[PDB]
Write a protein that holds these residues in place. Structure first.
Motif, PDB file in Angstrom:
ATOM      1  N   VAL A   1     -13.165 -23.381  99.605  1.00 49.92           N
ATOM      2  CA  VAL A   1     -14.427 -23.690  99.440  1.00 49.92           C
ATOM      3  C   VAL A   1     -15.512 -22.560  99.875  1.00 49.92           C
ATOM      4  O   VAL A   1     -16.144 -21.895  99.147  1.00 49.92           O
ATOM      5  CB  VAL A   1     -14.982 -24.966 100.110  1.00 49.92           C
ATOM      6  CG1 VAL A   1     -16.444 -25.199 100.267  1.00 49.92           C
ATOM      7  CG2 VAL A   1     -14.554 -26.223  99.211  1.00 49.92           C
ATOM      8  N   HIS A   2     -15.033 -21.927 101.168  1.00 49.35           N
ATOM      9  CA  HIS A   2     -15.929 -20.872 101.641  1.00 49.35           C
ATOM     10  C   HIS A   2     -15.977 -19.595 100.873  1.00 49.35           C
ATOM     11  O   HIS A   2     -16.534 -18.615 100.400  1.00 49.35           O
ATOM     12  CB  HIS A   2     -15.791 -20.731 103.118  1.00 49.35           C
ATOM     13  CG  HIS A   2     -14.536 -19.730 103.627  1.00 49.35           C
ATOM     14  ND1 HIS A   2     -13.506 -20.336 103.992  1.00 49.35           N
ATOM     15  CD2 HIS A   2     -14.409 -18.450 103.604  1.00 49.35           C
ATOM     16  CE1 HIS A   2     -12.578 -19.298 104.268  1.00 49.35           C
ATOM     17  NE2 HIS A   2     -13.244 -18.229 104.081  1.00 49.35           N
ATOM     18  N   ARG A   3     -14.573 -19.337 100.511  1.00 53.21           N
ATOM     19  CA  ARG A   3     -14.301 -18.216  99.491  1.00 53.21           C
ATOM     20  C   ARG A   3     -14.995 -18.441  98.268  1.00 53.21           C
ATOM     21  O   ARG A   3     -15.778 -17.196  98.062  1.00 53.21           O
ATOM     22  CB  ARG A   3     -12.797 -18.378  99.234  1.00 53.21           C
ATOM     23  CG  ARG A   3     -12.196 -16.944  98.196  1.00 53.21           C
ATOM     24  CD  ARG A   3     -10.880 -17.040  98.355  1.00 53.21           C
ATOM     25  NE  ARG A   3     -10.071 -17.036  99.672  1.00 53.21           N
ATOM     26  CZ  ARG A   3      -8.927 -17.008  99.758  1.00 53.21           C
ATOM     27  NH1 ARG A   3      -7.931 -16.956  98.891  1.00 53.21           N
ATOM     28  NH2 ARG A   3      -8.468 -16.923 100.956  1.00 53.21           N
TER      29      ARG A   3
ATOM     30  N   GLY B   1     -18.875 -17.698  98.696  1.00 53.47           N
ATOM     31  CA  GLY B   1     -19.393 -16.599  98.971  1.00 53.47           C
ATOM     32  C   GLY B   1     -19.743 -16.475 100.409  1.00 53.47           C
ATOM     33  O   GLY B   1     -20.686 -15.727 100.545  1.00 53.47           O
ATOM     34  N   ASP B   2     -19.522 -17.508 101.290  1.00 49.15           N
ATOM     35  CA  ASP B   2     -20.144 -17.890 102.583  1.00 49.15           C
ATOM     36  C   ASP B   2     -18.993 -17.538 103.476  1.00 49.15           C
ATOM     37  O   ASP B   2     -17.775 -17.707 103.360  1.00 49.15           O
ATOM     38  CB  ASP B   2     -20.404 -19.303 102.779  1.00 49.15           C
ATOM     39  CG  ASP B   2     -21.721 -19.810 101.871  1.00 49.15           C
ATOM     40  OD1 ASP B   2     -22.290 -18.743 101.288  1.00 49.15           O
ATOM     41  OD2 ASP B   2     -21.899 -20.897 101.686  1.00 49.15           O
ATOM     42  N   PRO B   3     -19.378 -17.218 104.963  1.00 54.01           N
ATOM     43  CA  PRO B   3     -18.227 -17.170 105.796  1.00 54.01           C
ATOM     44  C   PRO B   3     -18.146 -18.572 106.364  1.00 54.01           C
ATOM     45  O   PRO B   3     -19.052 -19.617 106.138  1.00 54.01           O
ATOM     46  CB  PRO B   3     -19.155 -16.415 106.943  1.00 54.01           C
ATOM     47  CG  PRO B   3     -20.653 -16.866 106.800  1.00 54.01           C
ATOM     48  CD  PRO B   3     -20.908 -16.884 105.297  1.00 54.01           C
ATOM     49  N   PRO B   4     -16.767 -18.676 106.972  1.00 55.25           N
ATOM     50  CA  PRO B   4     -16.718 -20.127 107.375  1.00 55.25           C
ATOM     51  C   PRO B   4     -17.787 -20.645 108.357  1.00 55.25           C
ATOM     52  O   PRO B   4     -18.478 -19.925 108.944  1.00 55.25           O
ATOM     53  CB  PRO B   4     -15.383 -19.841 108.393  1.00 55.25           C
ATOM     54  CG  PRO B   4     -14.541 -18.601 108.058  1.00 55.25           C
ATOM     55  CD  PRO B   4     -15.872 -17.708 107.426  1.00 55.25           C
TER      56      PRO B   4
ATOM     57  N   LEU C   1     -18.858 -26.622  97.528  1.00 52.31           N
ATOM     58  CA  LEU C   1     -19.495 -25.417  97.288  1.00 52.31           C
ATOM     59  C   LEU C   1     -21.029 -25.490  97.441  1.00 52.31           C
ATOM     60  O   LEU C   1     -21.622 -24.819  98.113  1.00 52.31           O
ATOM     61  CB  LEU C   1     -19.030 -25.014  96.180  1.00 52.31           C
ATOM     62  CG  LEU C   1     -19.563 -23.427  95.689  1.00 52.31           C
ATOM     63  CD1 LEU C   1     -18.719 -23.108  94.734  1.00 52.31           C
ATOM     64  CD2 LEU C   1     -20.988 -23.432  95.024  1.00 52.31           C
ATOM     65  N   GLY C   2     -21.740 -26.626  96.759  1.00 47.34           N
ATOM     66  CA  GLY C   2     -23.196 -26.589  96.907  1.00 47.34           C
ATOM     67  C   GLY C   2     -23.629 -26.975  98.379  1.00 47.34           C
ATOM     68  O   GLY C   2     -24.624 -26.533  98.775  1.00 47.34           O
ATOM     69  N   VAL C   3     -22.928 -27.878  98.991  1.00 49.10           N
ATOM     70  CA  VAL C   3     -23.227 -28.210 100.343  1.00 49.10           C
ATOM     71  C   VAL C   3     -22.976 -27.044 101.311  1.00 49.10           C
ATOM     72  O   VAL C   3     -23.643 -26.763 102.329  1.00 49.10           O
ATOM     73  CB  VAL C   3     -22.548 -29.391 100.735  1.00 49.10           C
ATOM     74  CG1 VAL C   3     -22.544 -29.512 102.244  1.00 49.10           C
ATOM     75  CG2 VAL C   3     -23.068 -30.749 100.137  1.00 49.10           C
TER      76      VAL C   3
ATOM     77  N   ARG D   1      -2.881 -18.991  93.540  1.00 51.26           N
ATOM     78  CA  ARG D   1      -3.181 -18.193  92.144  1.00 51.26           C
ATOM     79  C   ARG D   1      -4.358 -17.263  92.136  1.00 51.26           C
ATOM     80  O   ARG D   1      -5.008 -17.429  93.161  1.00 51.26           O
ATOM     81  CB  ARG D   1      -3.507 -19.222  91.048  1.00 51.26           C
ATOM     82  CG  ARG D   1      -2.070 -19.989  90.595  1.00 51.26           C
ATOM     83  CD  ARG D   1      -2.375 -21.565  90.430  1.00 51.26           C
ATOM     84  NE  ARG D   1      -1.199 -22.178  89.661  1.00 51.26           N
ATOM     85  CZ  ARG D   1      -0.172 -22.698  90.457  1.00 51.26           C
ATOM     86  NH1 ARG D   1       0.096 -22.581  91.684  1.00 51.26           N
ATOM     87  NH2 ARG D   1       0.740 -23.379  89.652  1.00 51.26           N
ATOM     88  N   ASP D   2      -4.746 -16.470  91.161  1.00 50.70           N
ATOM     89  CA  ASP D   2      -5.917 -15.670  91.075  1.00 50.70           C
ATOM     90  C   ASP D   2      -6.889 -16.513  90.635  1.00 50.70           C
ATOM     91  O   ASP D   2      -7.262 -16.542  89.334  1.00 50.70           O
ATOM     92  CB  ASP D   2      -5.511 -14.444  90.076  1.00 50.70           C
ATOM     93  CG  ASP D   2      -6.693 -13.610  89.886  1.00 50.70           C
ATOM     94  OD1 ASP D   2      -7.591 -13.370  90.696  1.00 50.70           O
ATOM     95  OD2 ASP D   2      -6.806 -13.275  88.629  1.00 50.70           O
ATOM     96  N   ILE D   3      -7.822 -16.897  91.575  1.00 50.08           N
ATOM     97  CA  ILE D   3      -8.999 -17.904  91.034  1.00 50.08           C
ATOM     98  C   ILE D   3     -10.126 -17.279  91.900  1.00 50.08           C
ATOM     99  O   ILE D   3     -10.191 -17.442  93.108  1.00 50.08           O
ATOM    100  CB  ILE D   3      -8.678 -19.266  91.578  1.00 50.08           C
ATOM    101  CG1 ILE D   3      -7.510 -19.855  90.872  1.00 50.08           C
ATOM    102  CG2 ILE D   3     -10.071 -20.176  91.412  1.00 50.08           C
ATOM    103  CD1 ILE D   3      -7.060 -21.191  91.193  1.00 50.08           C
ATOM    104  N   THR D   4     -11.007 -16.885  91.044  1.00 48.10           N
ATOM    105  CA  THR D   4     -12.248 -16.189  91.718  1.00 48.10           C
ATOM    106  C   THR D   4     -13.488 -17.064  91.442  1.00 48.10           C
ATOM    107  O   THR D   4     -14.339 -16.746  92.340  1.00 48.10           O
ATOM    108  CB  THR D   4     -12.387 -14.652  91.199  1.00 48.10           C
ATOM    109  OG1 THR D   4     -12.762 -14.926  89.826  1.00 48.10           O
ATOM    110  CG2 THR D   4     -11.198 -13.955  91.307  1.00 48.10           C
TER     111      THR D   4
END
Ligand SMILES: [Cl-]
Length: 151
Positions: free
Chosen positions: A14-16, A19-22, A136-138, A65-68
């Motif tokens: 989720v944090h990845r 785009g957020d830090p843990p 992700l939204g939260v 897997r390669d998931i961006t």
């Protein structure tokens, strides 16, 4: 059980993808959600907890897997089959329901106002509609709330 595997890989993806830090607040909220789903039905507790086991396996494979983006993750779910697709979307909608089902408890655990707890539910709802999932939204909205109060 060992469904702290779920909470680990869930937070990690989720944090990845966000785009957020843990964020300790997200982790705390995530543990509160998964516990709320376990106590919501004691007659079906282990049925709920093993839905997590199948999801903890899903997020684990996702990290392999390669998931961006959320779209990659949604595509990986389809390749996994409807059990996993429904599984994530059931959990992600329950994430929002738990917040709405006990906003004062969320306010307590996270030490935020009830208006900010509503922002979390709202942020989760909109992220579900965008196909990104509520977590992700939260995650992203928790950063704004922290910034408005901390900074
Ligand atoms: Cl996190």
């Amino acid at each position: 059980q060992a469904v702290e595997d779920f909470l680990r890989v869930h937070s990690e993806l989720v944090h990845r993808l966000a785009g957020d830090p843990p964020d300790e607040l997200f982790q705390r909220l995530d543990r509160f959600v998964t516990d709320a789903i376990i106590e919501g039905n004691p007659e079906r507790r282990d049925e709920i907890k093993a839905d997590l086991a199948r999801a903890a396996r899903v997020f684990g494979e996702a990290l392999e897997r390669d998931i961006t983006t959320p779209e990659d993750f949604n595509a990986f779910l389809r390749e996994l089959g409807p059990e996993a697709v429904e599984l994530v979307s059931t959990f992600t909608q329950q994430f929002v329901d738990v917040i709405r089902g006990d906003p004062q408890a969320v306010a307590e655990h996270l030490n935020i106002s009830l208006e900010d707890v509503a922002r979390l539910a709202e942020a989760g709802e909109a992220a579900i509609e965008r196909g990104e999932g509520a977590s992700l939204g939260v995650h992203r909205e928790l950063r704004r709330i922290e910034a408005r109060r901390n900074s």
